[PDB]
A and B are shown apart, each in its own frame.
With several copies, the nearest count.
Chain A
Amino acid sequence: NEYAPLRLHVPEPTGRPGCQTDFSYLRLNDAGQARKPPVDVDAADTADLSYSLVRVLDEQGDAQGPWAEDIDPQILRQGMRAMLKTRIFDSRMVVAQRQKKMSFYMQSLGEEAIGSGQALALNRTDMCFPTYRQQSILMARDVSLVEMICQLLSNERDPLKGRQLPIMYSVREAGFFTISGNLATQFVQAVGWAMASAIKGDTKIASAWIGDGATAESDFHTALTFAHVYRAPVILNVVNNQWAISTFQAIAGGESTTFAGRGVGCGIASLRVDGNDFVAVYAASRWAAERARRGLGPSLIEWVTYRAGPHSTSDDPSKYRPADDWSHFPLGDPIARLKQHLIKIGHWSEEEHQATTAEFEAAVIAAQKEAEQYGTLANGHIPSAASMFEDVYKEMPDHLRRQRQEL
């Protein structure tokens, strides 16, 4: 009588197939609007910043605000070089996926700026704990495409000896920690790696990565807690692309909140940054890195971007969101935006663009030819079956010895 019946509440994306998304839910800010706090700023004094948007490049491509200071155009160039290489590589692999040359692939269309951006702000020795979607990091550190593709193929030449699903890369020399299909686990692992660096009086930092969806996983909260408790030199990266397969970020707990907000909550200085503004990505990443390396503490950055492509090759986004959704995303295309800016200040041109595209297209095609020379799905040219039992333990134990012998 007195109380109306309670109702379960289930969040829904404003946009469904056959409609138009209402991108109002993204609390956005104009370029240069957000301030640049000191590297020693207390976590508590970062609250506003967790609910706003650090962004440099405006609508017309001009840089605004304090985040625009001290930005070497040579770095932006490497950035442009990194994003394009990534995107082109991505395109290529999707195709080799259709033509049944590759088992499985995940794109990073629309997110190329983030990994590359941060990668360029870090040292090669600063180990990254990436998800399956930060191949841009590998690209910005100029990793052999041949070996990347070989892994994508499970060749006789796969560095992981075909033990691991395509894209689940591992490149210790590139400061790129072995990817695991299990979500979120790497976020805690990053914090531990930083704790180690701190324990040995080193100066290396950990770069941790996670998506919007995976923040709901328990290792997310474990990472923030440990990063905070021990003041570990970690950069904690949340990549909010609005989606987790078919699931809108509101079901991840984004409704009326921010992911950056959860860092402030556990006493970690937090930024929410335009994920498609390369300059902003670079500027925010440098800040966090410097904060960490100075020994002033961990940082949480929520990168606001959009998962423009399919979740994976097995995915069909047209079954749960508007097909033309990316067209309307207020933060546009990272490559497009950097391009406009880089031309307008005179360190880029349609010419260098077209050429750089052309050279990377060539580079991937070559490496793909180079890698396939060592096998395919179709070719039984794959790693040995006897290798299947190695590295399970340091020394092949008796029982695996029998199991290999029996083959």
Chain B
Amino acid sequence: ATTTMTMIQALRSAMDVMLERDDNVVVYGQDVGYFGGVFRCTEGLQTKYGKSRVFDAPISESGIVGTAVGMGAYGLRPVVEIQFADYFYPASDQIVSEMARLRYRSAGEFIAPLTLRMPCGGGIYGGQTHSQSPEAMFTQVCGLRTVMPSNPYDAKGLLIASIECDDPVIFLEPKRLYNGPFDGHHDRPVTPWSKHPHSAVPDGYYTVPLDKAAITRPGNDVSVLTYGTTVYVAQVAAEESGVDAEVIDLRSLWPLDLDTIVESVKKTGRCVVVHEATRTCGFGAELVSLVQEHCFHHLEAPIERVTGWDTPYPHAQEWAYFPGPSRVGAALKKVMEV
């Protein structure tokens, strides 16, 4: 059947399903066990499956990821959490030097079928260490697979898919989208998921295929490459600009759905990349580089990118930082210009 879920409940369900599906699946991390996570994402799981399967961990990111790598080498399927994406850094070494290269350097002898869920994104007065978007810290690591959902349905499906994937998955979750969709309008109080499309979530097992982007708003004027919170930002902004922009939710950051992208820009003739992450050397640059490589002649204008400023995430200046419908909108007009 089906139940109406929030992103939180969807992710929780995904873990509940896989926790049941596969004996080797284990869930751990800080406050993940008894308390059920500082975001409710793991509520009741420990009660249901036992401490041996879902448990609380010491405050040690490299410890969490490191032990997980060892657990994988043995043959488990660790779904492990890091409270905020901003705190992954201490695990950098285990992530890049070990988790990503375990299969390659052993010629397949040992593998790391791990999933790291890290809540990410800003737009919540998070400040410097509660709101960064470090996807570019991972997409550049050979051997990793980075994924970010934008709605409960995809959140559950992409998570189940991610856990089952035998490659290590960095699963980024936009906490801005935890309780409901968010377009960048803080003036208008935010609505829950129940009043929106894609909160209808199947109760049991199902997947959303990796490496497959999703056209949210079909258009002919501009291709808009984006993911996470900026998907809903691009949508609303497309409506306000008037511009008939095609909105693509990459869903899988890297590896990505290259065809869907090239197909859109090829038809369109112009594209705008949008992400919360800071400009310089962000994920947007690879996207710009890819489009430029495969859609050069079909390109009717320079590829634009609306991103967060090259600055640490501020608190008071929140809405001057976060790329909102206005700032995105301007770029949609800018590309459509002769």
Which residues of chain A have a CB within 8 Å of any CB of chain B?
Answer: 7-8, 10, 12, 16, 103-104, 127, 129, 154, 158-166, 168, 170-172, 177-178, 180-183, 185, 188-200, 206, 213-214, 216-219, 222-223, 225-226, 229, 244-247, 251-253, 319-320, 382-383, 385, 387-389, 391-394, 397-400, 403, 407
Contact of B58 among A16, A129, A199, A229 (CB under 8 A): A229
Contact of A154 among B57, B90, B145, B316 (CB under 8 A): B316
Given contacts A193-B70, A388-B321, contact A181 B128 (CB under 8 A): yes
Contact of A196 among B38, B56, B75, B311 (CB under 8 A): B75
Give the chain A neighbours of B125 by CB distance below 8 A: 103-104, 165
Q: Which of B60, B75, B89, B317 has the most CB of A within 10 A?
A: B60
Give the chain B neighbours of A382 by CB distance below 8 A: 316-317
Given contacts A182-B93, A185-B98, A247-B30, contact A196 B315 (CB under 8 A): no
CB distance from B278 to the nearest CB of A (A): 10
Give the chain A neighbours of B58 by CB distance below 8 A: 213, 216, 225-226, 229, 247, 251-253
Given contacts A185-B98, A382-B316, contact A172 B60 (CB under 8 A): no
Inter-chain CA distance A23–B63, complex, in Å, is: 28
Q: Which residue of B lies closest to A187 (CB)?
A: B66
Q: Contact check, B315 vs A165: say whether CB atoms are below 8 A apart.
A: yes
- Judged by DSSP, the binding face of B is loop
Which B residues from 59 to 99 make CB contacts under 8 A with A? Answer: 59-63, 66-71, 73-76, 86-87, 89-90, 93-94, 97-98
Q: Contact check, A172 vs B110: say whether CB atoms are below 8 A apart.
A: yes
Q: Contact check, B312 vs A163: say whether CB atoms are below 8 A apart.
A: yes
CB distance from B274 to the nearest CB of A (A): 15
Q: Contact check, A164 vs B105: say whether CB atoms are below 8 A apart.
A: yes
Give the chain B neighbours of A213 by CB distance below 8 A: 58-59
Q: Which residue of A lies closest to B26 (CB)?
A: A199
How many residue pairs between the two chains, A and B, have CB atoms under 8 Å in the bound complex?
Answer: 262
CB distance from A381 to the nearest CB of B (A): 10
Given contacts A10-B56, A188-B63, A382-B317, contact A163 B38 (CB under 8 A): no
Inter-chain CA distance A385–B322, complex, in Å, is: 12
The proximity string for B residues 98-110 relative to A, scoring 1 for CB distances below 8 Å and 0 otherwise, is: 1001111111111
Q: Contact check, B31 vs A389: say whether CB atoms are below 8 A apart.
A: no
B126 within 8 A of A: yes
Question: What class of interface size applies to chain B in its complex with A?
Answer: 35 or more
B255 within 8 A of A: yes
Given contacts A189-B70, A219-B66, contact A161 B107 (CB under 8 A): yes
Contact of A180 among B90, B129, B280 (CB under 8 A): B129
CB distance from A392 to the nearest CB of B (A): 5
Which 4 interchain pairs have the tightest Cβ spacing?
A192-B70, A181-B129, A162-B316, A192-B67
Which residues of chain B have a CB within 8 Å of any CB of chain A?
Answer: 26, 30-31, 33-35, 38, 51-53, 55-63, 66-71, 73-76, 86-87, 89-90, 93-94, 97-98, 101-111, 125-130, 142-143, 145, 165-167, 211, 255, 258, 279-280, 309-312, 314-317, 320-321
Q: Contact check, A163 vs B255: say whether CB atoms are below 8 A apart.
A: no
Contact of B60 among A10, A217, A320, A388 (CB under 8 A): A217
Q: List 26 A-B contacts (CB under 8 A).
A: A10-B33, A10-B52, A160-B105, A162-B315, A163-B128, A163-B315, A165-B129, A168-B105, A170-B105, A170-B109, A177-B110, A178-B109, A188-B67, A189-B73, A191-B66, A192-B69, A214-B59, A225-B58, A229-B58, A387-B317, A388-B321, A393-B145, A394-B165, A397-B211, A400-B311, A407-B320
Q: Contact check, B87 vs A183: say whether CB atoms are below 8 A apart.
A: yes
Q: Which of B26, B68, B126, B311 has the most CB of A within 10 A?
A: B311
Given contacts A8-B52, A397-B255, contact A219 B104 (CB under 8 A): no
Inter-chain CA distance A407–B327, complex, in Å, is: 9
Given contacts A182-B87, A394-B166, contact A226 B314 (CB under 8 A): no
Contact of B94 among A168, A188, A190 (CB under 8 A): A188
CB distance from A210 to the nearest CB of B (A): 10
Given contacts A391-B107, A400-B310, contact A165 B66 (CB under 8 A): no
Inter-chain CA distance A331–B110, complex, in Å, is: 38
Q: Contact check, B317 vs A162: say whether CB atoms are below 8 A apart.
A: yes
Inter-chain CA distance A263–B316, complex, in Å, is: 40
CB distance from B109 to the nearest CB of A (A): 4
